Design a protein around this ligand. Structure first.
Ligand SMILES: *[C@@H]1O[C@H](CO)[C@@H](O[C@@H]2O[C@H](CO)[C@@H](O[C@@H]3O[C@H](CO)[C@@H](O)[C@H](O)[C@@H]3O)[C@H](O)[C@H]2NC(C)=O)[C@H](O)[C@H]1NC(C)=O
Ligand SMILES: *[C@@H]1O[C@H](CO)[C@@H](O[C@@H]2O[C@H](CO)[C@@H](O)[C@H](O)[C@H]2NC(C)=O)[C@H](O)[C@H]1NC(C)=O
Ligand SMILES: CNC(=O)c1c(O)nnn1CCC(C)C
Ligand SMILES: *[C@@H]1O[C@H](CO)[C@@H](O)[C@H](O)[C@H]1NC(C)=O
Length: 662
């Protein structure tokens, strides 16, 4: 750390706020972007019949947590149900809805709602009792939907002032795009009893009119531009996926295996181009298979086998590395029952082990002391109570930066982990810090901050202005705190960070927060001179196709490590793409085709088995005619190879084995 006079530039920018009360469960919510508004909520028991034996305390900051004001009187100390949480409005709507507990015998529930970033609240009594949290229509923050304790679907067009029940007997409801609502309904019995017999409904006018877009429904889900629905198989207790890209007007069967009741589907990630779908393996395995879709969400390539996804807790380590296009990391179960971290750079086209740091030696999990990989601690390691304070961290505005606890060896080890960092989207790695730490990225990567994870109280904070290569430590208080967590504005564009914890026992361990402003550390604004040209996904500069991923390269401007300046709240990631010539690698095999060990070419399958044969017989005829190739979704290559073969019909092939009637 080459920062000069850093103590003097941070001492006057460190703002302590001690919460005198705040006893118990503490909920913290940010309200909007570029507002600095933070709500802190706590609830507790009181021996007052008049309060139904409960009260809340509610604090509000509007300077990114430097100072808080007690605004409990705005909700009349009413006990707030924290299971619902604070219902925070989209982007800068400033909408806030708290769900109160009401006494016995009430007609319906009660909410406290604010439309001005919690400066004023109004009380609203509901014609129903809410069963779920209230969901904002993403397009319009005035439109809300909620299920009632009677499984009624209620909608409000005026930010919860007035509600109407648009349908009864609803199991699950979700906002689509353009203020569209999808929901399932039950008939004879309960939602569980009518599984595989539910109906899937749609309404695009907030309940004025309805359309039934699916029958024999098990459940449904949304991902990217795709609507997925699981439907029964009439003869038995199994189900399969159908997909729609037109909000349920038309459907097609997904080329994915059917599953039983004790299996599950899980959308790992989805966008405008494709979806990552996990299919649980039959049996108590704790793993499944990742499948990647084509751009229609219909034809699926098998991407990764033995993908870890436990039933107990639903723990998976699948992580979109949001700081570099096409990069995803996850954990796989080897045959040896060990857990290995895998990384893909091309959207699940190929997976490989993570390259270990050059200066790192292998741990006891590796047979060879000098040959091993880097493995990453994520949700599963945390769920298993390993000493992992945080999961991997990446931000799209901090190009290439990835931070995670890990271990260098042949499998995820149980030892107390170090923190490792990548600046190139996961191609190369360095040990960032020794031991576990909480970490946060500020100013689009202009500053990285770390807090040591310790059993004893701490009073120091580590910061780096060169993407984690050099560090300096700042004592932010003379009264050490038992650290609990960091709070910083979502989007990693602020220069404010809030350190939360409680003081030592002799001080009644009240909650306290230290908010630090790094504006005097990054006093100078970045200029053009402080940015440098960087080709993403570079592995060999002498190669003409170096950096081509899904058919194109991207060349960035990014902040020089030696440059100590502020990117700014308005910082924009600058990148330019180079359109590579198409090769066979830019195409996936269409239905009825596969790739042999021989490179590139998609060849006709000899016989269609399992779900492939079920797709052929029952699939839509349009998808059953192809030449064997489809452009990879999101692939922008131009020129070069184009498949010569014309459109061959694959359904005659599967039906040819069956004797047909007249
Ligand atoms: C993995 O994470 C990356 C980064 O978060 C995801 O890329 C992001 O995808 C979203 C949705 O497709 C993009 O938002 C869109 O931006 C365009 C602007 O061109 C806007 O017009 C759209 O309305 C939409 O808001 C976002 O820009 C994009 N971010 C980057 C850096 O490319 C990616 O989708 C994730 N992978 C999967 C499988 O979900
Ligand atoms: C760090 O926190 C301060 C709050 O103390 C933020 O200050 C705000 O800055 C914006 C933009 O300059 C002003 O419009 C607001 O009036 C400021 N708020 C206050 C209370 O003065 C500051 O923006 C934060 N730093 C970053 C990078 O977001
Ligand atoms: C979390 N997974 C699920 O809720 C699930 C499941 O296991 N089967 N269908 N769905 C609904 C999801 C849609 C992809 C059909
Ligand atoms: C709080 O109590 C006052 C006084 O009884 C009442 O007027 C008000 O409606 C209540 N609710 C809110 C949100 O102020």
């Amino acid at each position: 750390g080459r920062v000069r006079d850093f103590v003097a530039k941070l001492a006057n920018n460190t703002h302590q706020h001690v919460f005198d009360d705040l006893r118990g469960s503490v909920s913290l919510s940010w309200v909007g972007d570029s507002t600095g508004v933070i709500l802190v909520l706590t609830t507790f028991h009181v021996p007052l019949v008049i309060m139904t034996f409960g009260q809340s305390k509610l604090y509000r900051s509007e300077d990114y947590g430097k100072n808080f004001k007690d605004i409990t009187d705005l909700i009349n100390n009413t006990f707030i149900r924290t299971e619902f949480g604070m219902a925070i409005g989209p982007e800068n709507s400033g909408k806030v809805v708290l769900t109160a507990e009401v006494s016995g015998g009430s007609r319906g529930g009660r909410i406290f709602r604010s439309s001005d970033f919690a400066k004023n609240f109004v009380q609203t009594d509901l014609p129903f009792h809410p069963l779920t949290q209230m969901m904002y229509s993403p397009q319009n923050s005035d439109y809300l939907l909620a299920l009632s304790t009677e499984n009624g679907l209620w909608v409000s067009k005026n930010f919860g002032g007035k509600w109407e029940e648009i349908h009864k007997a609803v199991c699950l409801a979700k906002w689509g795009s353009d203020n569209t609502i999808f929901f399932t309904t039950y008939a004879n019995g309960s939602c569980k009893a009518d599984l595989g017999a539910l109906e899937l409904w749609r309404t695009s006018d907030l309940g004025k009119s309805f359309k039934t877009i699916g029958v024999k429904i098990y459940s449904f889900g949304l991902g990217g531009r795709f609507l997925f629905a699981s439907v029964m198989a009439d003869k038995d207790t199994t189900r399969r996926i159908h997909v729609s890209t037109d909000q349920g007007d038309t459907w097609s069967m997904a080329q994915l295996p059917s599953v039983g009741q004790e299996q599950f589907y899980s959308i790992l990630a989805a966008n405008d181009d494709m979806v990552f779908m996990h299919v649980d393996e039959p049996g108590d395995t704790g793993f499944g298979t990742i499948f990647t879709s084509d751009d229609r969400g219909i034809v699926y390539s098998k991407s990764l086998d033995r993908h870890l996804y436990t039933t107990t807790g639903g723990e998976t380590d699948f992580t979109n590395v949001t700081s570099l296009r096409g990069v995803y990391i996850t954990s796989v179960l080897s045959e040896d029952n060990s857990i290995q971290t895998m990384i893909t750079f091309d959207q699940g086209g190929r997976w490989t082990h993570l390259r270990k740091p050059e200066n790192s030696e292998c741990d006891a999990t590796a047979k060879n002391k000098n040959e091993c990989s880097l493995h990453i601690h994520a949700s599963y390691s945390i769920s298993q109570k390993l000493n992992v304070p945080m999961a991997p961290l990446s931000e799209p505005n901090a190009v290439g930066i990835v931070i995670a606890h890990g271990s260098v060896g042949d499998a995820i080890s149980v030892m107390v982990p170090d923190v490792y960092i990548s600046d190139d989207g996961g191609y190369s790695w360095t040990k960032m810090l020794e031991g576990p730490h909480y970490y946060t990225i500020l100013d689009s990567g202009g500053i990285i901050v770390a807090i040591e994870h310790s059993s004893r109280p701490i009073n120091v904070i580590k910061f780096s202005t060169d993407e984690g290569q050099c560090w300096q430590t700042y004592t932010f208080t003379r009264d050490p705190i038992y650290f609990t967590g960091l709070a910083s504005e979502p989007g990693a564009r602020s220069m404010n960070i809030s350190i939360w914890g409680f003081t030592e026992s002799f001080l009644t361990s009240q909650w306290v927060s230290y908010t630090i402003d790094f504006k005097d550390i990054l006093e100078r604004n970045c200029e053009e001179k402080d940015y440098t040209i960087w080709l993403a996904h570079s592995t060999d500069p002498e190669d003409y196709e170096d950096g081509c991923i899904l058919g194109y390269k991207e060349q960035f401007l990014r902040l020089r490590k030696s440059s100590m300046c502020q990117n700014g709240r308005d910082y924009v990631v600058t990148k330019q793409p180079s359109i590579c010539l198409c090769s066979l690698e830019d195409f996936l095999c269409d239905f009825g085709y596969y790739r042999p060990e021989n490179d590139s070419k998609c060849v006709e399958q000899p016989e269609l088995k399992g779900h492939d044969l079920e797709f052929c017989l029952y699939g839509r005829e349009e998808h059953l005619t192809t030449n064997g190739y489809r452009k990879i979704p999101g692939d922008k290559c131009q020129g070069g190879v184009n498949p010569v073969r014309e459109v061959k019909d694959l359904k005659k092939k599967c039906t040819s084995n069956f004797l047909s009637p007249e």
